[PDB]
Design a binder for these strands. Structure first.
Ligand SMILES: Nc1ncnc2c1ncn2[C@@H]1O[C@H](COP(=O)(O)OP(=O)(O)OP(O)(O)=S)[C@@H](O)[C@H]1O
Ligand SMILES: Nc1ncnc2c1ncn2[C@@H]1O[C@H](COP(=O)(O)OP(=O)(O)OP(O)(O)=S)[C@@H](O)[C@H]1O
Ligand SMILES: Nc1ncnc2c1ncn2[C@@H]1O[C@H](COP(=O)(O)OP(=O)(O)OP(O)(O)=S)[C@@H](O)[C@H]1O
Ligand SMILES: Nc1ncnc2c1ncn2[C@@H]1O[C@H](COP(=O)(O)OP(=O)(O)O)[C@@H](O)[C@H]1O
Ligand SMILES: [Mg+2]
Ligand SMILES: [Mg+2]
Ligand SMILES: [Mg+2]
Lengths: 588, 341, 320, 330
DNA sequence: TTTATGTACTCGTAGTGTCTGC
DNA sequence: GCAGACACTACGAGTACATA
DNA sequence: TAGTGTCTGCT
DNA sequence: GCAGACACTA
């Protein structure tokens, strides 16, 4: 599939990842997802096997003929080349402009600079992708004074008026910093930027930008028509560098989001970290994403024309796919390759891709989805994705991987079932190996701290259980429920201890026997009088409650310990409020 | 007090009508209290072990053992993970429980016992839930009780003493507390119902209460009180025997396992188990009750029952050797469903 | 006390990019960067001993020999690297005004950068972004996954592969002519086999052979250094009869003074990296080998545990 | 110390002081002697089991290089002292950078028991070794090579210390007996060889305990009975009798024989299991399954013995495992 | 998030000493 | 000479990592 | 204003 | 895998 896709893209053919009604021809193999198998039959789409693919290459003439789809694709491709040539001499004329100006100044350093710096977007029209996010940021910034006049009470149609500060988050290399700086520069604001190079703890944040919330640029007066030239746009790049739960400045930046008299902008990479939790509902969240290949294709054509080296236009898609939408790293790749290899073409693309592949660590959900696939445990699949690859895949998120495997290993339809083995048998084997991995995990995280035993836990808790039940997920990748239930159980244990030691005097029973035996009896001494006679037994319930040194808080705590048919949440709800109101007042 | 289980608890050795031979043994031990060694009472749950311990303390020290208060001691582990534990102290003795963090139960055994071992001539320390120690508090306690013995003594109360390590069982005088028969439970319940006011027709209902508790004084007493309260203090011949909500949930889970043996049944069982563990119910008791509820189903033959008990033993070992309790229970249920289907 | 001669590892370290052997394309790219001079930020990664840091040093030397002392800051794991001791020093070096030839930039070599703290890398991000006009960075780490994503984004990734037998053989012959030492082809192939792509290991073993026996033959080479235990463990796991594996284990590991924990870890690594057998067989072997590993770690390290592990391997292999 | 020698254990009283007194590792000693004579000492790495003569060899080598006052000329670091990366950054860096304060030679750094060193310390040590290799040599002594980083293993020449053979143990025993005026029977010598298991320290400790065992240390000769009584090890005759009773007789005779053998001299069950395993490895078993059953069951039994439990149950389990495994023979 | 030691790092604070000044 | 005024080392609290 | 192509968070 | 939102094209 990978090699055929390389040959499919070898002749300028778009290779979509999903089957559609407008799809022209589908190359059929042996086995794939059932959704594709049912989609091809009903829509009567043209199907050509691999034997017809070989004669397709020789039979199809160049340019794709005069077909309606082929003609439309060519003129769009020519337009992409046309706009590439139009902007190629735009900087060349600019380069001649600055060189003449520089020569005059000398009488009366370039071409030795990183390509990601010289080819940086001069204005907002030179960016590639995320047009909507850029315009959203610009509309928020240009209307910040209007929201300041309205005291941030009512926003507009977009809803950015209420948010005093905007936030930028997205993957590396896509242009958050450049977009923010260009939007700040275009409107005429004065950019006040901080970063991880200098300390940004609580103390110097209080002694630094804190006094800049309602003060203007000293250079702003001396730089002057401009109406926004004497203000601050706080640009904190790399918010993730505040690696401090308490001594860090994340809560301090939250306090700035609370109170600030000037536009403020944040740039980070990943938002969903527990460290950066206090930023959940604070700022106009502007999300950037991996841009589509067309804009980068045009920009790379401009760069290649300007740099006197040629790469095939179809190669750009493979370069973007290899680098995972990192434009700056694409320019770095071009600069590194162009030193000796001046021809980036069909022959060098495979070596370039396998040499510059980006090994990005996967998220827990992607790890679970990748691990419960029946293809990688097949004979052909496992050769490409070896066992060490699966071990590394676990080790990307080893703290969460076994939990994510255990959460949804029985929610998937298996495709690696042994002959004569039912799904339940595979689930039983996976559960047994999960228990063994749990034992190994307890041994690892103990007094001995046998951290050299981690790969065995990796296998036993993620690789072996998944290799028995791998295939297609019936539902969706679900987050582990053990964390929330564990927190709930710890809280319930804390309450159980509190009430147990409140009734410790006179009770010869430990905390375990309190819940199993004592607590069901307390319900029929502290709730049934409320049910069978109402408020007429207010004193009797208080008499029992006071006898065991039980407070009003303990009364509500006991009711939540019950399960099944003895759940008292509905029983208390059905009790009238007048009856319950008197019980609280009499105790107080 | 308000509950009948704590209202008629005996306060002396002569006030016990529960085990004659055990009470005679305790009287023999209290006859010469000076050379009393470190004790270890073990037996089935709910039989009255701590009642025996308090009665023995009263026989050795005197009235005032039951005039006890609660004080809180501050303990600091590694780093600044502050832990609050309250000791239920008293004149003439001390009471401590592993109710602290299971991985932090060593620090209380070290510091508190070294503090109270500073200086008739000794103080008694009672350790409830002694089977819940994690092999390190016991390791410290070995030398803690071997070195300091002329000023401190231990009464180590536990059930199913297998987790207790060999040296601790070596330096502890083991005392066995058997559960009573049906007649003794019925006699105690009859004493309760004649000390209080309950209308009863035929004492067969008391025999049924004794049968349901399965040799448990606490469960039988609480069941009697609950049934009297539900029946408006007038017990009937066909009064419905109550069961804890946990028992009903476990029985429903067993019926679900027996009836349907699919994987959606397995995820439903996972949800039920998650609720049960989240509601303060130990995993080993859960596995034991699930096993003995599965073995009570009459539709199974001997092969399925043997496989169920074998897997139950294996996963009981796993539960004792592991910390993620839901993992082993889910594995056990999956194995049982694979065996039955 | 007598002084010691320079080891062959450091005596014959390359000083130019032509003497280094191995990845021809990467070295040619480095030489074209040498000619052009506009060296981008680079990360160099690979397994130890294949010419990572010597290539960086050669590139820096040829780029600015006259200013190697002035405009090259070689910080490393031996030096104290943190948040402040890195940010202050690197910022002072990057802002430092030093006059280069027009195509030259100051080079900050972060040798052994995989052990760096994440916050230090976060500060380095903005350092490289701001001062790329004057200074350039050159990382060199064994494991490139430790470096955070933005640094790998703002860098040119240069991956180094383990050398084939031909390149190590060529370097060995060159050093042999330079040192004028007698040798036999069998001994040279033994040295290459023992090195396993590591040039430094090959040089060390060759020097040990020369200084201990004088003639580089198979007998002397196998006398001073044993065959690698991964290979003997691999052929122990892949043997047919249980008796064959048992006797291989005993003779070649137990009587050779190899620790049981080392044998178990080597077996785990081989089974993870083993390829001919089926995946499920490897998973079962890893499970039981890990059980044996737990037994060894708990304190029971004997010959009987290893023999039982091999017996379980054979009980798995013969399919009940 | 105090009162000079004769108040030391024989392990420390007979530590080699010259490279000619280190027996067994003839190839290693000859190679390092050639290294120091030719004037080229690389970064050494001594690997091997405990008691094989690693730290003795490096101490004798340093003494040969420098002299009597080698302790002040050599920085010896061990797991007893703190060896964090601050130590590598300050103490090792200063010792490698500075000149010799007492002579005009090179610096020697001995990283004794370096397998207990953190990963970051070894990572720093890589650069420290490469930077100052011109006038500073590193020696690394380790029992486990899996705890050392692969780059550190690459930087250091590896010398493997093979377990002490027959001749070396016999020569050291002869030297000790000559020094202590002690006598020893040849069968007792073979018993001590068997109990050595490649450990010279065990030999020296057993010799000291057996000299203390004799009623008069003079004019009484150590016999194999003295060795087996002092060490508590089972005699080969006892092991053969137990195995014969298990393999030939019924359960009552086998159980009675094992109990009698254990209770006659207080034999331990793990020692009997090890002896039985050593005897059974020499057997010509017909089936491939007898070996599997024997090895797996005996490993489980010895693991349970290590964890502790009931000795009678474990002994009956041993008898049953052996009999059931040998039932697969025919 | 739980996890249980040991290591390494980072920060903040409290003492601890020395240099200016009157 | 005495009281600050400073920069300095040292101690304590907290976070993060632990196999390739 | 409505069909795909594709990147992205689910705790 | 299950939506869910952002685009290009129609
Ligand atoms: N959308 C884009 N169009 C064109 N060039 C781009 C684009 N995004 C990035 N670049 C190039 O990449 C260089 C640096 O981009 P940055 O904006 O610094 O990346 P980033 O979004 O800040 O990601 P970080 O901050 O490194 S995680 C620019 O100078 C451009 O050369
Ligand atoms: N390709 C090579 N050509 C010539 N000599 C080489 C080559 N690779 C390694 N060497 C020799 O190996 C010795 C040290 O190699 P280094 O490059 O310092 O190892 P390394 O690549 O830095 O690996 P690490 O990760 O730093 S241990 C010197 O003697 C070099 O001459
Ligand atoms: N080859 C040998 N020749 C003579 N005596 C030896 C030999 N090997 C060991 N010994 C004795 O063993 C004693 C202790 O062994 P050492 O060599 O000091 O320690 P080691 O051999 O390095 O073992 P480790 O790894 O440190 S536990 C010495 O004092 C010697 O008496
Ligand atoms: N001789 C007795 N007479 C009446 N009640 C008894 C007697 N012995 C025990 N009990 C009952 O047992 C209960 C205490 O049991 P408990 O100490 O919890 O047992 P365990 O310590 O084994 O859990 C008390 O409520 C008490 O009513
Ligand atoms: Mg940025
Ligand atoms: Mg290097
Ligand atoms: Mg030593």
């Amino acid at each position: 599939r990978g090699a055929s896709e390389a040959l499919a893209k070898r002749y300028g053919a778009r290779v979509t990842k999903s089957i559609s009604s407008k799809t022209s021809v589908v190359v059929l193999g042996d086995e794939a997802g059932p959704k594709k198998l049912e989609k091809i039959k009903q829509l009567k789409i043209k199907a050509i096997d691999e034997e017809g693919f070989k004669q397709l290459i020789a039979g199809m003439p160049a340019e794709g003929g005069d077909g309606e789809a082929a003609e439309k694709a060519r003129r769009k491709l020519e337009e992409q080349h046309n706009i590439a040539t139009k902007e190629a001499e735009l900087l060349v004329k600019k380069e001649e402009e600055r060189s003449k100006k520089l020569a005059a100044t000398r009488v009366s350093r370039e071409e030795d600079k990183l390509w990601t710096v010289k080819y940086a977007p001069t204005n907002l029209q030179q960016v590639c992708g995320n047009k909507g996010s850029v315009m959203k940021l610009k509309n928020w910034l240009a209307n910040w004074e209007n929201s300041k006049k309205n005291s941030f009470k009512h926003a507009g149609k977009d809803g950015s008026g209420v948010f005093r500060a905007a936030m930028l988050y997205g993957p590396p290399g896509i242009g958050k910093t450049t977009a923010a700086h260009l939007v700040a520069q275009e409107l005429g604001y004065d950019i006040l930027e901080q970063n991880a190079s200098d300390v940004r703890s609580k103390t110097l944040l209080n002694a630094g930008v804190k006094n800049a919330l309602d003060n203007m640029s000293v250079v702003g007066y001396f730089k002057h028509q401009n109406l926004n030239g004497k203000h601050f746009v706080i640009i904190m790049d790399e918010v993730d560098g505040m690696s401090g739960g308490d001594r860090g400045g994340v809560g301090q930046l939250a306090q700035f989001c609370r109170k600030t008299s000037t536009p403020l902008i944040l740039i980070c990479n990943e938002r969903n970290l527990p460290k950066m939790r206090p930023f959940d509902r604070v700022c106009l969240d502007i999300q950037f994403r991996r841009p589509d290949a067309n804009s980068i294709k045009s920009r790379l054509m401009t760069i290649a024309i300007r740099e006197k080296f040629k790469l095939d236009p179809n190669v750009i898609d493979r370069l973007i796919q290899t680098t995972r939408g990192d434009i700056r790293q694409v320019i770095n790749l071009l600069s590194t390759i162009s030193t000796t290899t001046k021809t980036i073409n069909h022959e060098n693309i495979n070596e370039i891709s396998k040499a510059w592949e980006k090994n990005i660590a996967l998220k827990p959900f992607d790890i679970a989805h990748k691990m419960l696939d029946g293809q990688i445990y097949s004979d052909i699949g496992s050769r490409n994705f070896t066992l060490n690859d699966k071990i590394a895949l676990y080790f990307d998120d080893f703290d969460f991987t076994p939990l994510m495997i255990q959460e949804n290993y029985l929610s998937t339809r298996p495709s690696v079932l042994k002959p004569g083995q039912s799904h339940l048998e595979a689930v039983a084997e996976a559960a047994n190996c999960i228990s063994l991995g749990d034992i190994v995990e307890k041994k690892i995280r103990s007094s001995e701290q046998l951290w050299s035993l981690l790969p065995l836990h990796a296998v036993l808790s993620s690789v072996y259980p998944a290799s028995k039940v791998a295939g297609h997920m019936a539902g969706r990748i679900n987050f582990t429920a053990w964390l929330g239930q564990n927190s709930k159980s710890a809280k319930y244990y804390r309450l159980l201890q509190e009430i147990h030691y409140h009734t410790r005097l006179g009770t010869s029973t430990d905390k375990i026997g309190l819940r199993l035996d004592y607590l069901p009896t307390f319900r029929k001494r502290l709730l049934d009088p409320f049910l069978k006679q109402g408020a007429d037994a207010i004193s009797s319930v208080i008499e029992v409650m006071d006898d065991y040194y039980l407070t009003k808080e303990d009364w509500d705590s006991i009711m939540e310990f019950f399960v099944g048919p003895d759940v008292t949440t509905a029983i208390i709800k059905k009790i009238p409020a007048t009856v319950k109101s008197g019980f609280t007042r009499k105790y107080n | 007090m308000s509950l009948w289980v704590d209202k008629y608890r005996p306060k002396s050795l002569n006030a016990l009508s529960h085990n004659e031979e055990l009470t005679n043994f305790l009287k023999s031990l209290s006859d010469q209290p000076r050379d009393l060694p470190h004790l270890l009472l073990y037996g089935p749950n709910g039989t009255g072990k701590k009642t025996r311990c308090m009665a023995l303390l009263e026989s050795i020290f005197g009235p005032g053992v039951y005039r006890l208060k609660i004080d809180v001691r501050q303990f600091v582990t590694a780093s600044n993970r502050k832990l609050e534990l309250n000791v239920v102290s008293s004149p003439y003795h001390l009471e401590i429980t592993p109710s602290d963090m299971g991985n932090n139960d060593r620090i209380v055994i070290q510091e508190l016992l070294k503090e109270v071992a500073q200086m008739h001539r000794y103080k008694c320390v009672i350790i409830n839930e002694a089977n819940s120690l994690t092999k390190d508090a016991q390791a410290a306690l070995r030398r803690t009780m071997e070195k300091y013995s002329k000023n401190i003594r231990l009464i180590m109360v536990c059930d199913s003493m297998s987790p207790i390590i060999a040296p601790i069982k070596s330096r502890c005088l083991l005392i066995r507390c058997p559960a009573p028969s049906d007649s003794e439970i019925s006699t105690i319940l009859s004493d309760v119902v004649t000390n209080e006011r309950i209308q009863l027709e035929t004492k067969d209902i008391l025999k049924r209460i004794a049968q349901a508790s399965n040799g448990n004084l606490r469960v039988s007493l609480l069941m009697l009180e609950s049934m009297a309260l539900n029946n408006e203090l007038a017990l009937k011949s066909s009064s419905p025997i109550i069961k804890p909500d946990w028992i009903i949930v476990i029985h429903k889970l067993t019926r679900k396992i027996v009836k349907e043996r699919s994987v959606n049944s397995l995820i439903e069982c996972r949800a039920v188990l998650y609720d049960l563990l989240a509601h303060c119910i130990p995993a080993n008791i859960i596995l034991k009750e699930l096993t003995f509820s599965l073995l009570d189903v009459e539709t199974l033959n001997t092969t399925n029952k043997s496989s169920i008990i074998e897997y139950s033993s294996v996963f009981d070992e796993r539960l004792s050797l592991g910390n993620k309790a839901i993992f082993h229970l889910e594995g056990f249920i999956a194995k049982v469903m694979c065996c039955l289907d | 006390t007598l002084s010691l001669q320079l080891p062959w590892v450091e005596k014959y370290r390359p000083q130019v990019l032509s003497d280094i052997v191995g990845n021809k394309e990467t070295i040619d790219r480095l030489q074209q960067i040498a000619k052009d001079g506009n060296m981008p930020h680079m990360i160099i990664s690979g397994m130890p001993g294949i010419g990572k840091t010597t290539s960086v040093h050669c590139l820096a030397h040829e780029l600015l020999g006259r200013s190697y002392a002035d405009g090259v800051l070689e910080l490393n794991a031996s030096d104290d690297r943190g948040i402040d001791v890195v940010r202050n020093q690197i910022k002072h070096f990057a802002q430092k005004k030093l006059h280069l030839p027009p195509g030259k930039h100051k080079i900050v070599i972060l040798d052994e950068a995989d052990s760096m703290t994440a916050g230090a890398q976060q500060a380095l991000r903005r350092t490289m972004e701001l001062y790329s006009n004057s200074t350039r960075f050159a990382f060199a780490c064994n494991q490139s996954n430790k470096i955070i994503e933005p640094l790998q984004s703002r860098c040119a990734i240069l991956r180094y592969s383990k050398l084939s037998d031909e390149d190590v053989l060529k370097r060995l012959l060159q050093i042999i002519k330079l040192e004028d030492v007698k040798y036999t082809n069998d001994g040279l192939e033994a040295i290459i086999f023992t090195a396993e792509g590591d040039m430094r290991q090959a040089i060390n073993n060759l020097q040990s052979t020369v200084a201990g026996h004088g003639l580089v033959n198979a007998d002397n080479v196998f006398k001073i250094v044993d065959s690698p235990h991964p290979l003997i463990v691999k052929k122990m796991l892949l043997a047919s009869n249980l008796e064959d594996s048992i006797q291989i284990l005993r003779t070649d590991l137990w009587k050779k003074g190899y620790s049981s924990i080392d044998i178990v870890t080597t077996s785990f690594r081989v089974t993870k990296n083993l390829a001919q057998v089926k995946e499920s067989v490897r998973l079962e072997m890893i499970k039981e080998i890990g059980l044996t590993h737990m037994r060894i770690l708990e304190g029971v390290g004997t010959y009987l545990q290893l023999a039982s592990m091999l017996a379980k391997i054979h009980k798995l292999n013969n399919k009940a | 110390e105090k009162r000079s020698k004769e108040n030391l254990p024989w392990v420390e009283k007979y530590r080699p002081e010259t490279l000619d007194e280190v027996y067994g590792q003839n190839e290693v000693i000859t190679t390092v002697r050639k290294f120091v004579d030719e004037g080229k000492l690389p970064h050494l790495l001594f690997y091997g089991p405990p008691g094989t003569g690693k730290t003795s060899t490096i101490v004798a080598l340093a003494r040969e290089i420098y002299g009597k006052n080698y302790s002040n000329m050599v920085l010896e670091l061990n797991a007893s002292d703190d060896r964090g990366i601050d130590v590598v950054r300050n103490q090792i860096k200063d010792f490698a950078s500075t000149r010799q304060i007492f002579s005009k030679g090179f610096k020697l750094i001995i990283l004794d028991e370096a397998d207990a060193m953190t990963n970051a310390a070894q990572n720093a040590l890589r650069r420290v070794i490469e930077r100052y290799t011109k006038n500073t040599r590193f020696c690394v002594l380790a029992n486990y090579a899996h705890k050392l980083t692969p780059a550190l293993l690459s930087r250091c020449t590896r010398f493997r210390f093979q377990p002490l053979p027959q001749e070396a143990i016999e020569r050291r025993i002869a030297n000790v007996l000559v020094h202590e005026k002690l006598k020893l029977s040849p069968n007792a010598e073979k018993a001590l060889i068997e109990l050595s298991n490649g450990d010279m320290r065990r030999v020296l400790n057993v010799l000291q305990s057996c000299k203390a065992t004799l009623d008069n240390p003079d004019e009484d000769e150590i016999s194999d009975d003295v060795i087996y009584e002092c060490c508590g090890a089972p005699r080969p005759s006892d092991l053969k009798a137990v195995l014969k009773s298990i393999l030939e007789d019924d359960w009552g005779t086998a159980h009675y024989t094992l109990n009698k053998v254990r209770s006659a001299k207080g034999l331990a069950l793990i020692d009997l299991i090890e002896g039985i395993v050593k005897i059974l490895e020499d057997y010509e078993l017909q089936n491939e399954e007898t070996r599997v059953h024997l090895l797996t069951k005996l490993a489980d039994i010895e693991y349970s013995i290590s964890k502790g439990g009931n000795d009678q149950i474990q002994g009956s389990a041993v008898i049953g495992a052996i009999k059931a495994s040998f039932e697969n023979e025919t």
